[PDB]
């Protein structure tokens, strides 16, 4: 037995400034593990991470990604899968993200999508302080995570 | 309203030899429409065609794609979603195909996946005769298509 329960999929590109939030989280976890999470350093596209996640047979999947939500830099929100669909959130390959989330939810049964608001996103940009702070905030909630980890739902109307 | 019922997604790359089966079907349809199908010339990856298919609000989606099924060149089969999953069929972006099909099934209802067996797949290869023939065969069934268009299920 693997004894796997929780899986954390970190999405992003460290070569794209604040889009590096996900890879940064993966780096922190590698250096100092928190909780029971198996952490996937997913990079730019979640599509090619799906097969591994399903094979891990998790009970709970957390996805962390820098995502423009129209908020102040570094704000953290959980995005409801219905709002993922309504917002037309896309992967880098222009796949609608709700397709992946909704299907994962059928196989896993708790799937949480967590967005962190970037400020600057561009090739070889540095990460800004509010995003570094947000990544620390999420990291510190990984141990003993329950529900939505105490984070607010994104308000989309 | 658009009055749309049937959508045909053609998958493939004309610059990859027998992988051009899908694009060829799109070309035939554009030149001489068959049935009520709205035909999407989907190219290499179906991922970026999903939003348009969903917006079209079809009741039935037929997907046509050159796919290695371990059969003789030009053989045509319908691949059941269970088998798509078990085979670990992948898109060009390594997205499992079964996730895409299963979610389309929720949004559309009836989703049919038709595979055509290629022989040769390579950059700037020609298409081989059995695959040309297979594309013609599928084309001729589009008008008045019912069920799985008379094609056999892939045995795997
Ligand atoms: Ca990936
Ligand atoms: Ca991102
Ligand atoms: Ca499913
Ligand atoms: Ca501790
Ligand atoms: Ca496409
Ligand atoms: Ca061959």
Curated annotation (Swiss-Prot), chain B:
What name is this protein filed under?
Answer: Hydrogenase 3 maturation protease
The UniProt family comment states: Belongs to the peptidase A31 family.
Keyword annotations from UniProtKB, A to Z: Aspartyl protease, Hydrolase, Metal-binding, Nickel, Protease
- Regions crossing the membrane: none
Q: Which InterPro entries match?
A: Pept_A31_hyd_mat_HycI, Pept_HybD-like_dom_sf, Peptidase_A31
* Enzyme class, spelled out: hydrolase
Report the EC number(s), separated by commas if there are several. Answer: 3.4.23.51
Q: What is the lineage of its organism?
A: Bacteria, Pseudomonadati, Pseudomonadota, Gammaproteobacteria, Enterobacterales
GO terms in the biological process aspect are: protein processing
Drop me one GO molecular function for this one: aspartic-type endopeptidase activity
The outcome of changing residue 19 to N is: No protease activity
Q: What does this protein do?
A: Protease involved in the C-terminal processing of HycE, the large subunit of hydrogenase 3.
Keyword Metal-binding, does the record have it?
A: yes
- CDD domains this protein is in? H2MP_MemB-H2evol
* Annotated Ni(2+) binding sites: 19, 65, 93
- Write down the Pfam families for this protein, in alphabetical order: HycI
Question: How does it associate, per the subunit comment?
Answer: Monomer.
Outcome of substituting residue 65 to N/M: No protease activity
- Origin organism is Escherichia coli (strain K12)
């Amino acid at each position: 037995a693997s004894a796997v329960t929780d899986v954390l999929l970190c999405v992003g590109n460290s070569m794209m400034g604040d889009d590096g939030a996900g890879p940064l989280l993966a780096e922190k976890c590698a250096a100092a593990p928190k909780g029971n999470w198996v952490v996937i350093d997913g990079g730019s596209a979640p599509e090619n991470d799906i097969v591994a996640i399903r094979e891990l047979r998790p009970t709970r999947l957390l996805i962390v990604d820098a995502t423009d939500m129209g908020l102040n830099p570094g704000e953290i929100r959980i995005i409801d899968p219905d709002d993922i669909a309504e917002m037309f959130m896309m992967t880098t390959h222009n796949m609608p993200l709700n397709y992946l989330i909704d299907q994962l939810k059928e196989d896993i049964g708790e799937v949480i999508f967590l967005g962190i608001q970037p400020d600057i996103v561009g090739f070889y940009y540095p990460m800004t302080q509010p995003i570094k702070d947000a990544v620390e905030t999420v990291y510190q909630r990984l141990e003993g995570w329950e529900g939505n980890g105490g984070f607010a739902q994104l308000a989309v109307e």
